[PDB]
Design a protein around this ligand. Structure first.
Ligand SMILES: [Ca+2]
Lengths: 278, 280
């Protein structure tokens, strides 16, 4: 099961890379720097957790594979742009990323701002195209979901809470850092899973179960990260080492449990929760 | 015509303020600052030129007025976020915009980055809702058009060309600054006019006439801007390249050209006609 996953992963990574290169031809005009920055940030980089989730979820319902990949690129556009902006000096001020210089270092601050801005627009351009799905109602569902997942009630909202924690001398509580995770990383994860239910025209019960999986692995992910990282409150600082470890493991079990109404079609999502999140 | 135009402008301004206020409730969780930054930028502008164009174009056909206004809010999301990101120290460093301190000044740099980021997302959320149009294809057409108009092949692409001009010692030529305008400001104007055609379920011939109007007023607007800014005093501009007399006459000709695209409409197009003349 870990081998079928490790190879799904590689197929996904090379496909997303292909899609981005194809989506981002370098224009023969002064937009050259902008698009080269977009390609620099979007191509080659991450392990494509988000496109992977989209592909693995769409596989529950035998969704058109190609369209599933493009939805993957759309969510990855949002993820990548968020990283470009997060890395900037006024934010996390990071010099490196994938062992490679961040956009504002390789290019400049303004190029980082604009390349991120363009990638957000591109996510919606991609989702909007007819190749995604013939049912227009479907495409609208994906677009509304992504817009909510990306903005003030989603990823950016989470970024903002994180910024508030860093600039406040009042330590946050467990409910607030939980809400922080739900928005900062959980919104995009939730989109990945929900996109599958949408692409498959599934019912509320199935939609709810997939979003619960996303909810639970997202939290497990952050708890694990709060452990790996070792002044603001964290799951480690609030739960302590022992309970944080046990709660991360419990969340993984829970995430898998949400998929229990599925047969073996849900096996990729099971593996993702273990051999990646755990 | 200018009298009704002023009235429409004041009305659109009030409506857009109402709509943004309703769209942006302030949470008591730590997202408070983000949303207050969004409200600060979006509310109490602001001539709302882009909402005005949407409203005046939808008026050509039988489009629900509140729906037209919401599309106006959506395009204004893109415009406002673009100003927030443009004012930042990384870009133009403006501490002020029409007597109003910029977001990074009233708040901080990080809040300006995020409030702009959230506003771009908000534009697409707004367009996706059924409130806009019962027909799903109308909404999808608007969304596709906005994403193209906003990104690397639109507004941000234009922003990039401008940034390239400012950080190079090689003066751009007429073709390049023409492309610069088409993208930097022309793309959003194009959306405003095309949105009216889309909301009105209009044919390709009508859509093209409207986009041609946007193209012409957008160029005229930039030429007039190149003129205005010069009156109040080294990258190439329409003024530097064309010279004073040619830039003046071309701005004027472009207004006439913009209006001529509307010759197939009756008095319902008077707002758009006035707006074009106003852009001078
Ligand atoms: Ca600028």
């Amino acid at each position: 099961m870990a081998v079928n996953l490790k190879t799904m992963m590689e197929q996904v990574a090379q496909d997303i890379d292909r899609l981005f290169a194809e989506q981002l031809p370098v224009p023969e005009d002064p937009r050259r720097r902008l698009v080269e920055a977009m390609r620099y940030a979007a191509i080659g980089g991450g392990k494509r957790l988000r496109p992977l989730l989209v592909v693995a979820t769409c596989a529950l319902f035998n969704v058109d594979r190609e369209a599933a990949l493009r939805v993957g690129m759309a969510i990855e556009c949002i993820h990548v742009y968020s990283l470009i902006h997060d890395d900037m000096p006024c934010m996390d001020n990071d010099d490196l990323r994938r062992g490679k210089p961040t956009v504002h270092k390789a290019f400049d601050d303004a190029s980082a701002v604009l390349s991120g801005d363009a990638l957000q627009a591109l996510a919606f351009e991609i989702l909007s195209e007819e190749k995604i799905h013939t049912d227009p109602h479907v495409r609208l569902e994906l677009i509304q979901a992504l817009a909510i997942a990306s903005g003030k009630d989603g990823m950016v909202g989470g970024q903002a809470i994180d910024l508030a924690a860093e600039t406040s001398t009042v330590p946050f509580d467990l409910p607030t850092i939980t809400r922080l995770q739900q928005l900062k990383t959980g919104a995009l994860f939730g989109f990945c899973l929900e996109a599958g239910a949408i692409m498959g025209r599934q019912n509320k019960d199935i939609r709810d179960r997939l979003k619960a999986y996303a909810r639970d692995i997202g939290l497990a992910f952050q708890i694990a990260d709060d452990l790996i990282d070792a002044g603001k409150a964290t799951f480690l600082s609030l739960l302590g080492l022992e309970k944080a470890r046990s709660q991360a493991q419990a969340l993984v079990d829970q995430a898998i449990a949400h998929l229990s109404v599925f047969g073996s079609e849900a096996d990729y999502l099971r593996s993702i929760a273990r051999y990646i999140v755990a």
